Design a protein around this ligand. Structure first.
Ligand SMILES: Cc1nnc(CNCCN2C(=O)c3cccc4cccc(c34)C2=O)s1
Ligand SMILES: *[C@@H]1O[C@H](CO)[C@@H](O)[C@H](O)[C@H]1NC(C)=O
Ligand SMILES: *[C@@H]1O[C@H](CO)[C@@H](O)[C@H](O)[C@H]1NC(C)=O
Length: 572
């Protein structure tokens, strides 16, 4: 049938009223009411500069949307793809099974990229843009996006596509008539860590993730591609690793597939940042190489944080020839990344100390068999690994390592330095380590486990009960988590944050629900850094969830749809 209700703004809330036929007032559809009742309308994330949306809408012909690229250059392929992608984005305003009337004005999208040759990712890349929308004569609209690079430009296309609403009362596609927007992100690094080694994730599900990331302007996919449980990364120079390491022959990431993903990400302003976690978090794949110790060691609680146990043996020269080859194979297909993640997850002294060859190496070099000695072995490893990474990427590039014993601020400067190493932080924001690190000039990527671990809250995968970092982190807690509050003065040293999806209990099937719409909360926090909290973003978060679902993302449900149609009535 046809929609029977209407909506009217009242103290910032769209109230549902009956659409009585005996009225001279034009009825508002739910989202038409929302676009103007809300401070920032249906925008996610909300802009950092000007947010002038005006007061009116305009009927639009869907078939009469034409995009024109004004400045041409090296990024022609990228801009043409992003423009072709724009028409499809506009259709996301329309609910499936509803068709818009083919009438209304024509839309002219004018893309001006003022440095059409820049297409490299860097922490200094300019992702700012300007958005102007105004009527053009009688039967058309002037939509102009102006930005310093392609990245800001496609960010602007994203924001522009959010200015379309569907009127399901009349079946009209509408657009905001007069907009003036200036925008740019607060943090340069906005990411998701996807663990694809504890469980496999189809290429299609990964592209689908990147698609959703772009929709809320997140720019980094950190691809945790290897661990102790599997080695799906197809390494040509050391094919024995993925042949023995993969969960199955089909559960693998080939050079062609990775290139597809990397290119797909580039077209969408997403840096695909590969990680090889070492010298811990290794196992499957390294059988019969004699380059690991403690693999499947029992009882596992004595040797590692989670089974199977396994670490690299740094005392063997051949290890670094394997490492160089792995890095080189990564550098070849991950060819948009400006950064490389080397893991640095906590090493087990117990494991290294159980090895004959390792103990002899430490005695014959005078070191002892104490915690400080094994910290030297780790430094010894990381220094040589680092050297090979540089040779592999054919240049020096920033490296990322987790907060660990090795990166304790008290002694991190012994072999690490703040110009070469970025530190990813899992510890809670009130930990002394963050302050100690910030003061020694180190840059941070925030991934604090109490706000940013998207795996928390489920059943136990060893034993019974729940998983280690329960309870489940609602989007509210991730939205409110602010690096600016954590960093304080040293906040420019914070590069941004990363939602971490560890995959002991997540794979292809649970991917959508794990990330969305929670990652959108991180998206707004890192793009805008609001002084306002989650309550002020609630209505817009509900809408962005619906947009994800319309995109085909199987996003988590936050609230009854009733709350979305009846703002103000669901509260606590
Ligand atoms: C990177 C990093 N990601 N997470 C980090 C912190 N490690 C948390 C420690 N931990 C636990 O403290 C733990 C307690 C009880 C059961 C458990 C089952 C599996 C795994 C764990 C675990 C576990 O990993 S560092
Ligand atoms: C469209 O709008 C921009 C910004 O107001 C303006 O500078 C430009 O000249 C307009 N383009 C056309 C062809 O109307
Ligand atoms: C390593 O093992 C030796 C005995 O084999 C012991 O003396 C030493 O304390 C151990 N090191 C650590 C850190 O446990």
């Amino acid at each position: 049938e046809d929609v029977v209700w209407r909506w009217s703004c009242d103290n910032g809330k769209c109230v549902k009223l009956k659409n009585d036929p005996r009225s001279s007032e034009p009825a508002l559809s739910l989202e038409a009411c929302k676009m103007f009742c809300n401070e920032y309308g249906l925008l996610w994330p909300r802009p950092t500069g000007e947010a002038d949306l005006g007061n009116f809408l305009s009927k639009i012909n869907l078939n009469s949307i034409e995009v024109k690229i004004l400045k041409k250059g090296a990024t022609d392929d990228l801009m043409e793809a992003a423009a072709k992608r724009f028409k499809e984005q506009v259709s996301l305003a329309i609910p499936r099974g509803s068709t818009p009337k083919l009438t209304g004005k024509a839309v002219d999208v004018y893309l001006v990229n003022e440095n059409p040759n820049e297409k490299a990712f860097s922490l200094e890349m300019d992702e700012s843009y300007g958005l102007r929308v105004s009527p053009s004569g009688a039967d058309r609209v002037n939509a102009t996006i102006t930005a310093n690079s392609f990245f800001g430009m496609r960010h602007g296309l994203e924001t522009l596509s959010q200015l379309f609403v569907f009127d399901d009362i009349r079946d009209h596609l509408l657009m905001v008539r007069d907009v003036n927007i200036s925008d740019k992100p607060v943090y340069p690094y906005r990411g998701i860590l996807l663990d694809t080694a504890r469980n496999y994730y189809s290429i299609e599900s990964i592209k689908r993730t990147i698609e959703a990331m772009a929709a809320v302007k997140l720019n980094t996919l950190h691809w945790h591609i290897t661990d102790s449980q599997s080695f799906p990364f197809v390494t040509t120079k050391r094919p024995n690793l993925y042949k023995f390491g993969a969960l199955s022959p089909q559960k693998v990431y080939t050079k062609a597939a990775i290139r597809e993903v990397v290119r797909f990400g580039l077209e969408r302003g997403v840096r695909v940042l590969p990680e090889f976690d070492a010298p811990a978090h290794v196992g499957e794949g390294w059988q019969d190489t004699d380059l690991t110790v403690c693999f499947k060691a029992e009882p596992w609680k004595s040797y590692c944080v989670e089974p199977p146990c396994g670490q690299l043996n740094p005392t063997k020269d051949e290890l670094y020839q394997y490492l160089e080859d792995i890095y080189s194979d990564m550098a070849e297909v991950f060819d948009t990344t400006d950064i490389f993640h080397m893991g640095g997850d906590e090493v087990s002294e117990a494991c290294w100390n159980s090895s004959d060859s390792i103990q002899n190496f430490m005695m014959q070099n005078r070191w002892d068999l104490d915690k400080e000695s094994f910290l030297k072995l780790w430094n010894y490893f990381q220094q040589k690994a680092q050297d090979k990474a540089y040779k592999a990427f054919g240049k020096k590039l920033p490296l990322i390592l987790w907060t660990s014993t090795l990166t304790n601020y008290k002694h991190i400067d012994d072999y690490l330095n703040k110009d070469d190493y970025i530190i990813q932080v899992w510890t809670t924001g009130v930990d002394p380590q963050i302050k100690g690190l910030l003061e020694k000039g180190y840059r941070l990527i925030m991934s604090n486990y109490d706000a940013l671990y998207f795996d928390c809250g489920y059943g136990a995968w060893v034993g019974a009960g729940n998983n280690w970092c329960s309870p489940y982190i609602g989007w509210q807690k991730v939205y409110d988590n602010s690096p600016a509050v954590i960093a304080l003065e040293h906040r420019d040293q914070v590069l941004g944050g990363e939602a971490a999806l560890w995959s002991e209990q997540s794979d292809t099937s649970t991917l959508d629900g794990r990330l969305w719409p929670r990652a959108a909360a991180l998206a707004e926090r890192l793009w805008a850094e609001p002084a306002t909290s989650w309550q002020d973003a609630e209505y817009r978060m509900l809408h962005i969830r619906e947009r994800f679902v319309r995109m085909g993302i199987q996003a988590e449900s936050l609230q009854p749809e009733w709350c979305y149609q009846n703002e103000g009535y669901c509260y606590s």
